Paper text:
Enzymes within this family function in distinct pathways including inositide signaling, gluconeogenesis, and sulfur assimilation. INPP1 catalyzes the metal-dependent hydrolysis of the phosphomonoester bond from the 1 position phosphate of Ins(1,4)P2 or Ins(1,3,4)P3 to yield inositol 4-phosphate and inositol 3,4-bisphosphate, respectively. Conserved secondary structural elements comprise juxtaposed metal binding pockets and define a shared sequence pattern of D54…E79E80…D153PID156S157T158…D317 as shown for INPP1.
Although we could not confidently model the substrate in the resultant structure, metal sites GD1 and GD3 became equivalently occupied. Difference Fourier analysis showed densities peaks of 20.5σ and 20.0σ in metal sites GD1 and GD3, respectively, giving a relative occupancy of 1.0. Consistent with the Fo-Fc differences, anomalous differences peaks of 15.4σ and 14.0σ were calculated, giving a relative occupancy 1.1. Whereas in the absence of substrate, the gadolinium in metal site GD3 were found at half occupancy and had B-factors greater than twice the average, and in the presence of substrate, the gadolinium in site metal site GD3 was well ordered, refined to full occupancy and had B-factors well below the global average. Co-crystallization with Gd3+ but in the presence of substrate (I(1,3,4)P3) resulted in equivalent occupancies of metal sites GD1 and GD3 consistent with the hypothesis that substrate binding alters affinity at metal site GD3 by contributing an additional coordinating ligand through phosphate oxygen. The observation occupancy at a second/third site is also consistent with previous kinetic studies which demonstrated metal binding in INPP1 is cooperative with a Hill co-efficient of 1.9 which predicts if metal site 1 is predominantly bound in the absence of substrate, that an additional two metals are bound cooperatively upon substrate binding. It is noteworthy that the addition of substrate resulted in a significant change in the ratio and intensity of electron density peaks such that metal sites equivalent occupancies of sites GD1 and GD3, each having a tremendous signal exceeding 20 sigma. Anomalous signals confirm this is because of metal binding. While we did not observe the Ins(1,3,4)P3 substrate, we hypothesize the sulfates and/or phosphates seen in the INPP1 structures represent the 1- and 4-PO4 positions that would be found with ordered substrate or reaction product.
Numbering used by the authors: 1 to 31, 48 to 237, 262 to 273, 284 to 340, 349 to 358, 366 to 389
Write the structure that this text describes.
């Protein structure tokens, strides 16, 4: 699934473009638009993968429905393309005939982006298409996205809030076993040029298939824990489900622990796969308080009931579990 992973990187950077535009571009910034933006990103990934790999389109699941409601109360089925003009005519039904906003989105949705890791072009791993399911969280950390803080100082490499906490989560899992095989995390807002206002992004991929474990090149640099801003259970507050998982991937945090039932398969799947590829993973917190990995094939519905612990090292985990 190296050719599938390489294609999931492209659409994630295409998703990042849509995430950046709706903050950067000023027509869209003024403007429920977030739910629209989520479905639009979710439908871009769904169709592009269907296009390049026929049969995967019906195996791509996500946080949002493909159906939205406008101010008139009409229910619209969000199907993009094939031409740019049809997407304008579809979005103008949802945004109350707002042509400036409809033309703006459609231009980014139909924008050919060429994002490729040459490291992944070298590797030739094949995974049967028939055993693959995909979980998608289009733009994670809704609150931090809409507020849009670009001026927050990180506490020891970890941003407590701000646009850095926003991530595009695309996970791929085995349908039969439920084990996450591949995962892509895209930070659309990492570094801003103060003068030009332009945001530079960063993507992270990982593969774990039948003992073959490869991941993206990670930048250099007792225990360092990262909890959510609402967590009421050296500890760090950090916003965004995806970002807190990325902190464990980047080594900024040793453990990410979430107690509540308000995380879902699409929040964790992408990170879990990348963590698996570095010899880590995610366990059920409640089952550990009585190593059971999170599954992504069976429901309960698609919430991680009993919380989760995200770990990079299995030794770091055992130490943390000994204290708790
Ligand atoms: Gd290939
Ligand atoms: Gd959403
Ligand atoms: Gd389609
Ligand atoms: Gd989320």
């Amino acid at each position: 699934g190296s050719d599938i992973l390489q294609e999931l990187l492209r659409v994630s950077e295409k998703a990042a473009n849509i995430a950046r535009a709706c903050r950067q571009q000023e027509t869209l910034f003024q403007l429920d638009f977030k739910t629209l933006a989520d479905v639009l990103v979710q439908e871009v990934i769904k169709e592009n993968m269907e296009n390049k790999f026929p049969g995967l389109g019906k195996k791509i699941f996500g946080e949002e429905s493909n159906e939205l409601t406008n101010d008139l109360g009409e229910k619209i089925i969000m199907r993009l393309g094939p031409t740019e003009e049809e997407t304008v005519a579809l979005l103008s039904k949802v945004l109350n005939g707002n042509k400036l906003a409809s033309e703006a989105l459609a231009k980014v949705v139909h924008q050919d982006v060429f994002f490729s890791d040459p490291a992944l072009d070298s590797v030739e791993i094949n995974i049967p298409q028939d055993i693959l399911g995909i979980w998608v969280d289009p733009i994670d950390s809704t609150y931090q996205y809409i507020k849009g803080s670009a001026d927050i100082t990180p506490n020891q490499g970890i941003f407590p809030s701000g646009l850095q906490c926003v991530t595009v989560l695309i996970g791929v899992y085995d349908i039969q076993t439920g084990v996450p095989l591949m995962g892509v995390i895209n930070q659309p807002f990492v570094s801003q040029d103060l003068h030009t206002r332009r945001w530079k992004g960063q993507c992270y991929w990982g593969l774990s298939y039948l003992g073959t474990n490869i991941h993206s090149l990670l930048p250099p640099v007792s225990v360092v824990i990262s909890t959510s801003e609402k967590e009421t259970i050296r500890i760090f507050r950090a916003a965004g489900a995806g970002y807190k998982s990325l902190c464990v991937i980047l080594g900024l945090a040793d453990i990410y622990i979430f107690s509540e039932d308000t995380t879902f398969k699409w929040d964790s799947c992408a990170a879990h796969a990348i963590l698996r590829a570095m010899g880590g993973g995610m366990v059920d917190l409640k089952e550990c308080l009585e190593l059971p990995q999170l599954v992504y094939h069976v429901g309960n519905q698609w919430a991680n009931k009993g919380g989760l612990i995200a770990y990079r090292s299995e030794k770091q985990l055992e130490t943390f579990l000994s204290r708790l």
